[PDB]
Amino acid sequence: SSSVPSQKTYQGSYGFRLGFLHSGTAKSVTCTYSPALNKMFVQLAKTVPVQLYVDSTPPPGTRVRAMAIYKQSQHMTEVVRRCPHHERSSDSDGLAPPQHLIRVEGNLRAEYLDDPNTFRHSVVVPYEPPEVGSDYTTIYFKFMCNSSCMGGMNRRPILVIITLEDSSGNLLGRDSFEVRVCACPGRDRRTEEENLRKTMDGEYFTLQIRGRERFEQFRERNEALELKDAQAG
């Protein structure tokens, strides 16, 4: 169990914040971001473009770090790892250490860290200004395990924290977004957005039940009711 890093959005002096491509939701999309959920949906090991915006250029030596943590409070102290199956497969590509869930693509100056005090994984790269005629710098990531990987994330949602820091590692800025690695990003984005939509217009509701046995009674009853809805229509 490890201490939990802060996820507080912080633009800092240089006005640091993330930007994402506006994509559709066709079942064939390999990667799609949901603004309404601040959640990125992507397929296994598929490229994820992330835009870095600043209002003023940071000093030389500035760096950008990516780290993942579990979103659920009860699993926050558990380091996010790849499942054993994917991690120990004999056919690793060697492009990055095999234990890292998050990789940076297209950057040979990328450094992978395994913190000596928290044992948390992160990948870091030198901050680079936008290309001429552009106001953002692009970073491409790849996630090496599905959200449902047993022995890994095991269907637990994760948050990706991006921090802007100086050469020493001091904080300059921070932002984050949720991530779900799945087979069909398009339909999953639509499903989760619909779930949010139905919750806001009073179609879906949630209830907190005390005690595991009590909760189970309520869940079983709710199932019978939905089975009855299915049968009714």
208 part of the interface to a copy of itself, by CB under 8 A: yes
From the list a copy of itself, Zn ion, none, partner contacted by residue 145 (C-beta under 5 to 8 A by kind): Zn ion
Coil, helix or strand at residue 86? helix
Report the distance separating Cα 186 and Cα 26, nearest Å.
Answer: 5
Please state, in angstroms and as integers, the Cα–Cα distance from residue 93 to each residue in 64, 144, 151, following that order. 24, 12, 21
50 part of the interface to Zn ion, by CB under 5 A: no
191 part of the interface to a copy of itself, by CB under 8 A: no
Report the distance separating Cα 190 and Cα 148, nearest Å.
Answer: 18
Report the distance separating Cα 180 and Cα 191, nearest Å.
Answer: 13
Residue selected from 133, 212, 231, 233 as contacting a copy of itself according to rule CB under 8 A? 212
Q: State the binding string over 146-185 for a copy of itself (x if CB under 8 A, else -).
A: ----------------------------------------
Report the distance separating Cα 1 and Cα 77, nearest Å.
Answer: 5
Q: Is the alpha carbon torsion for 192, 17, 172, 42 positive or negative?
A: positive
206 part of the interface to a copy of itself, by CB under 8 A: yes
Q: Looking at beta carbons only, is 9 or 13 nearer to a copy of itself?
A: 9
Q: Is 128 exposed, middle or buried (0-12, 13-18, 19+ CB in 10 A)?
A: middle
Report the distance separating Cα 168 and Cα 149, nearest Å.
Answer: 35
Report in angstroms how near the CB of residue 142 gets to Zn ion at its nearest.
13
200 part of the interface to a copy of itself, by CB under 8 A: no
∠158-159-164 over CA atoms, to 5°?
Answer: 150
203 part of the interface to a copy of itself, by CB under 8 A: yes
From the list Zn ion, a copy of itself, none, partner contacted by residue 162 (C-beta under 5 to 8 A by kind): none
Structure-token pair, residue 214: 């009590």
Residue selected from 104, 124, 145, 164 as contacting Zn ion according to rule CB under 5 A? 145
Q: Which residues bind a copy of itself (CB under 8 A)?
A: 198-199, 202-212, 214-215, 218-219, 221-222, 225-226, 229
Q: Which residues bind Zn ion (CB under 5 A)?
A: 83, 86, 145, 149, 152
